[PDB]
Amino acid sequence: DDVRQYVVRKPLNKEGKKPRTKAPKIQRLVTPRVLQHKRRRIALKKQRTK
RNA sequence: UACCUGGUUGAUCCUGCCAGUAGCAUAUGCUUGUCUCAAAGAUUAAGCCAUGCAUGUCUAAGUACGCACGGCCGGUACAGUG
């Protein structure tokens, strides 16, 4: 299941302002940056062994 | 600048101190136009203390769901500043 399509929203409404919705930032979420950080530090494990 | 001078006797020469002399530090008195630098609640009481201040801190890079403000363009995980 995709996790990011299941976040609750904040129905953010105040007078005079535009209608707004707001969502939190998901933590402990596997993203293409996290997987690059993991494989970068095994590129350092190989560099030291060489 | 490696220095003495007054005072014991009727007069002398001594011993010998007292007093004078110059600086330097704290206070104090009287006086004080300019300008440069500058010590400053140590001495008595390491006594007692109203009030204020003297220690806080965020970057691209720990954690942002405060509309606090704006803001995409509007299904759009999290724009951003915070």
Can you spell out the DSSP letters for A21-50?
EE-PPPSS---HHHHHHHHHHHHHHHHHH-
Resolution of the experimental model, in Å, one decimal: 3.0
Q: Å from A39 (CA) to B31 (C1')?
A: 90
Are the beta carbons of A32 and A38 closer than 8 angstroms?
A: no
A27 CA, B60 C1': separation in Å? 19
* Nearest C-alpha neighbor of A26 from the set A6, A50, A46, A48: A6
- Picking from A4, A6, A34, A9, the residue whose alpha carbon sits closest to that of residue A20 is A9
Experimental method: cryo-EM
Q: Is there a contact between A27 and A7 (Cβ–Cβ < 8 Å)?
A: no
Distance CA(A17)–CA(A35), nearest Å, equals 40
Beta carbons of A26 and A4 less than 8 angstroms apart: yes
